[PDB]
Design an enzyme around this catalytic site. Structure first.
Site, PDB file in Angstrom:
ATOM      1  N   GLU A  97      48.043  13.036 -11.517  1.00  0.00           N
ATOM      2  CA  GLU A  97      46.602  13.207 -11.378  1.00  0.00           C
ATOM      3  C   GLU A  97      45.875  12.587 -12.567  1.00  0.00           C
ATOM      4  OE1 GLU A  97      45.683  17.322 -10.707  1.00  0.00           O
ATOM      5  OE2 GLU A  97      44.153  16.793  -9.210  1.00  0.00           O
TER       6      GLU A  97
ATOM      7  N   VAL B  59      48.577  11.291  -6.968  1.00  0.00           N
ATOM      8  CA  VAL B  59      49.747  11.061  -6.149  1.00  0.00           C
ATOM      9  C   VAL B  59      50.211  12.445  -5.743  1.00  0.00           C
ATOM     10  CG1 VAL B  59      52.101  10.081  -6.045  1.00  0.00           C
ATOM     11  CG2 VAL B  59      50.367   9.066  -7.535  1.00  0.00           C
TER      12      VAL B  59
ATOM     13  N   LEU C 260      51.946  15.349  -7.605  1.00  0.00           N
ATOM     14  CA  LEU C 260      52.938  14.757  -8.478  1.00  0.00           C
ATOM     15  C   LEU C 260      52.288  14.118  -9.714  1.00  0.00           C
ATOM     16  CD1 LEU C 260      54.844  12.916  -5.624  1.00  0.00           C
ATOM     17  CD2 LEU C 260      55.750  14.916  -6.779  1.00  0.00           C
TER      18      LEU C 260
ATOM     19  N   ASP D   4      50.676  -6.566 -13.658  1.00  0.00           N
ATOM     20  CA  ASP D   4      50.880  -5.335 -14.376  1.00  0.00           C
ATOM     21  C   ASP D   4      52.372  -4.897 -14.378  1.00  0.00           C
ATOM     22  OD1 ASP D   4      49.918  -3.215 -15.963  1.00  0.00           O
ATOM     23  OD2 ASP D   4      49.514  -1.970 -14.190  1.00  0.00           O
TER      24      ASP D   4
ATOM     25  N   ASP E 287      53.370  -0.711  -8.160  1.00  0.00           N
ATOM     26  CA  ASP E 287      52.119  -0.868  -8.898  1.00  0.00           C
ATOM     27  C   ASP E 287      51.230   0.369  -8.672  1.00  0.00           C
ATOM     28  OD1 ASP E 287      49.773  -1.840 -10.133  1.00  0.00           O
ATOM     29  OD2 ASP E 287      49.911  -3.814  -9.191  1.00  0.00           O
TER      30      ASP E 287
ATOM     31  N   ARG F 123      56.845   1.374 -16.314  1.00  0.00           N
ATOM     32  CA  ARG F 123      56.095   2.454 -15.655  1.00  0.00           C
ATOM     33  C   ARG F 123      55.742   2.141 -14.190  1.00  0.00           C
ATOM     34  NH1 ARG F 123      52.611   0.011 -19.296  1.00  0.00           N
ATOM     35  NH2 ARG F 123      50.923  -1.166 -18.287  1.00  0.00           N
ATOM     36  N   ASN F 124      55.791   0.862 -13.807  1.00  0.00           N
ATOM     37  CA  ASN F 124      55.497   0.418 -12.416  1.00  0.00           C
ATOM     38  C   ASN F 124      56.744   0.015 -11.652  1.00  0.00           C
ATOM     39  OD1 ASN F 124      52.669   0.874 -12.458  1.00  0.00           O
ATOM     40  ND2 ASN F 124      52.350  -1.032 -13.564  1.00  0.00           N
TER      41      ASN F 124
HETATM   42  C1  LIG Z   1      53.964  -4.354  -6.146  1.00  0.00           C
HETATM   43  C2  LIG Z   1      52.679  -3.848  -5.537  1.00  0.00           C
HETATM   44  O1  LIG Z   1      52.830  -2.478  -5.015  1.00  0.00           O
HETATM   45  C3  LIG Z   1      51.703  -1.749  -4.737  1.00  0.00           C
HETATM   46  C4  LIG Z   1      50.508  -2.301  -4.341  1.00  0.00           C
HETATM   47  N1  LIG Z   1      49.611  -1.312  -4.151  1.00  0.00           N
HETATM   48  C5  LIG Z   1      48.255  -1.457  -3.739  1.00  0.00           C
HETATM   49  C6  LIG Z   1      47.325  -1.848  -4.694  1.00  0.00           C
HETATM   50  C7  LIG Z   1      46.001  -1.998  -4.328  1.00  0.00           C
HETATM   51  C8  LIG Z   1      45.657  -1.752  -3.028  1.00  0.00           C
HETATM   52  F1  LIG Z   1      44.357  -1.899  -2.665  1.00  0.00           F
HETATM   53  C9  LIG Z   1      46.560  -1.364  -2.069  1.00  0.00           C
HETATM   54  C10 LIG Z   1      47.896  -1.208  -2.418  1.00  0.00           C
HETATM   55  C11 LIG Z   1      48.885  -0.786  -1.379  1.00  0.00           C
HETATM   56  N2  LIG Z   1      50.144  -0.088  -4.403  1.00  0.00           N
HETATM   57  C12 LIG Z   1      51.412  -0.338  -4.760  1.00  0.00           C
HETATM   58  C13 LIG Z   1      52.350   0.748  -5.122  1.00  0.00           C
HETATM   59  O2  LIG Z   1      53.528   0.480  -5.384  1.00  0.00           O
HETATM   60  N3  LIG Z   1      51.821   2.031  -5.142  1.00  0.00           N
HETATM   61  C14 LIG Z   1      52.469   3.226  -5.532  1.00  0.00           C
HETATM   62  C15 LIG Z   1      53.628   3.233  -6.307  1.00  0.00           C
HETATM   63  C16 LIG Z   1      54.230   4.429  -6.666  1.00  0.00           C
HETATM   64  C17 LIG Z   1      53.679   5.627  -6.255  1.00  0.00           C
HETATM   65  O3  LIG Z   1      54.205   6.876  -6.560  1.00  0.00           O
HETATM   66  C18 LIG Z   1      55.423   7.284  -6.027  1.00  0.00           C
HETATM   67  C19 LIG Z   1      56.063   6.700  -4.968  1.00  0.00           C
HETATM   68  C20 LIG Z   1      57.278   7.240  -4.566  1.00  0.00           C
HETATM   69  N4  LIG Z   1      57.876   8.282  -5.128  1.00  0.00           N
HETATM   70  C21 LIG Z   1      57.243   8.870  -6.185  1.00  0.00           C
HETATM   71  C22 LIG Z   1      57.858   9.982  -6.801  1.00  0.00           C
HETATM   72  C23 LIG Z   1      57.256  10.600  -7.864  1.00  0.00           C
HETATM   73  O4  LIG Z   1      57.758  11.681  -8.537  1.00  0.00           O
HETATM   74  C24 LIG Z   1      59.110  12.081  -8.263  1.00  0.00           C
HETATM   75  C25 LIG Z   1      56.017  10.131  -8.353  1.00  0.00           C
HETATM   76  O5  LIG Z   1      55.519  10.830  -9.416  1.00  0.00           O
HETATM   77  C26 LIG Z   1      54.206  10.495  -9.870  1.00  0.00           C
HETATM   78  C27 LIG Z   1      55.406   9.057  -7.771  1.00  0.00           C
HETATM   79  C28 LIG Z   1      56.000   8.403  -6.679  1.00  0.00           C
HETATM   80  C29 LIG Z   1      52.539   5.599  -5.494  1.00  0.00           C
HETATM   81  F2  LIG Z   1      52.017   6.777  -5.101  1.00  0.00           F
HETATM   82  C30 LIG Z   1      51.917   4.434  -5.119  1.00  0.00           C
END
Ligand SMILES: CCOc1cn(-c2ccc(F)cc2C)nc1C(=O)Nc1ccc(Oc2ccnc3cc(OC)c(OC)cc23)c(F)c1
Ligand SMILES: [Cl-]
Ligand SMILES: [Cl-]
Ligand SMILES: [Cl-]
Length: 271
Positions: free
Chosen positions: A29, A35, A27, A152, A170, A156-157
């Site tokens: 890169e 992702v 999805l 952040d 995030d 976009r997040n």
């Molecule tokens: C508020 C803190 O939230 C977090 C902390 N951390 C974090 C930070 C540091 C650490 F050491 C550990 C963690 C867990 N990660 C997140 C987080 O939200 N990660 C995240 C967010 C989004 C991501 O992508 C998607 C998720 C779901 N559906 C998608 C659909 C898509 O297309 C249709 C799509 O296209 C690109 C992307 C999608 C993703 F893969 C990951």
């Protein structure tokens, strides 16, 4: 102690066996990682569509600890972390993976932009824009209430669920509060600043903040009292809410709770 007991509890819950997971298409890169869509087999034998983000020992434990904390959050406007796997590279470097529910609509920033094109999501009415702001505020209110600092916040997040609820996630200069540019200091009021910028990204249907201003000139631009300009067709009351987020003194900025009710009140008033 209980502090450490609660950490050990959260750690026990966060890990997912690699073979409960199948990875499909890419999805997204980048340098940071990737992702991919996937499936996750759950306890009941049924499977769930997921997204999987893929990123020496200390770093891994930091990652697990952080993950364990995110997974323990429970709020409808904060993304739910289902868990994490650690895969190992053939050169002996760990490949950490974060597993989240798959959200077909994707990130809020791209969705705003697609809405300005004929094939995309249709034109987003004002009521729906405000609802996105309210959703984000509610997630941030929850996180600030447990003293989590985002660092952040930007459109976009933020992710869009199937039922059009927005949640905080995030995966940067123009989102960074004036005090954090200067003193490299960060509080929840710095998050409020970023929220204000995020509101402006939503109200402009995805413009880049501060057209005509380069990143290298941002601190100075703000030092002289300049702020994001009011979007065309942005209600005066909505602009005041966002402008309040950028007050030079962090203590003068409203909290997320105050903001959230301001936005809900505005939304209820709309005919
Ligand atoms: C508020 C803190 O939230 C977090 C902390 N951390 C974090 C930070 C540091 C650490 F050491 C550990 C963690 C867990 N990660 C997140 C987080 O939200 N990660 C995240 C967010 C989004 C991501 O992508 C998607 C998720 C779901 N559906 C998608 C659909 C898509 O297309 C249709 C799509 O296209 C690109 C992307 C999608 C993703 F893969 C990951
Ligand atoms: Cl696989
Ligand atoms: Cl634009
Ligand atoms: Cl501007």
């Amino acid at each position: 102690g209980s502090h450490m007991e609660e950490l050990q509890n959260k750690l026990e819950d966060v890990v997912i066996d690699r073979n409960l997971l199948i990875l499909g298409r890419i999805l997204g890169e980048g340098e940071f990682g990737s992702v991919m869509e996937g499936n996750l087999k759950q306890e009941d034998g049924t499977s769930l569509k997921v997204a999987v983000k893929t990123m020496s020992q200390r770093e891994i434990e930091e990652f697990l600890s952080e993950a364990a904390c995110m997974k323990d959050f429970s709020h409808p406007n904060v993304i739910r972390l289902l868990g994490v796997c650690i895969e190992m590279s053939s050169q002996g470097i760990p490949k950490p993976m974060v597993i989240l529910p798959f959200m077909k609509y994707g990130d809020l920033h791209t969705y705003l932009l697609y809405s300005r094109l004929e094939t995309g999501p249709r034109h987003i009415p004002l009521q729906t824009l405000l609802r996105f702001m309210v959703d984000i505020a509610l997630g941030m209110e929850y996180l600030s209430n447990r003293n989590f600092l985002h660092r952040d916040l930007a459109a976009r997040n933020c992710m869009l669920r199937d039922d059009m609820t927005v949640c905080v996630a995030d995966f940067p200069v123009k989102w960074i509060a004036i005090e954090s540019l200067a003193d490299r200091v960060y509080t929840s009021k710095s998050d409020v600043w970023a929220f204000g910028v995020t509101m402006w990204e939503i109200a402009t249907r995805g413009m880049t903040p501060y057209p005509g201003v380069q990143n290298h000139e941002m601190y100075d631009y703000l030092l002289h009292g300049h702020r994001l300009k009011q979007p065309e067709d942005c209600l005066d009351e909505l602009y005041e809410i966002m402008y309040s987020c950028w007050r030079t003194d962090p203590l003068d900025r409203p909290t997320f709770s105050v903001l959230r009710l301001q936005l809900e009140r505005l939304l209820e008033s709309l005919p």
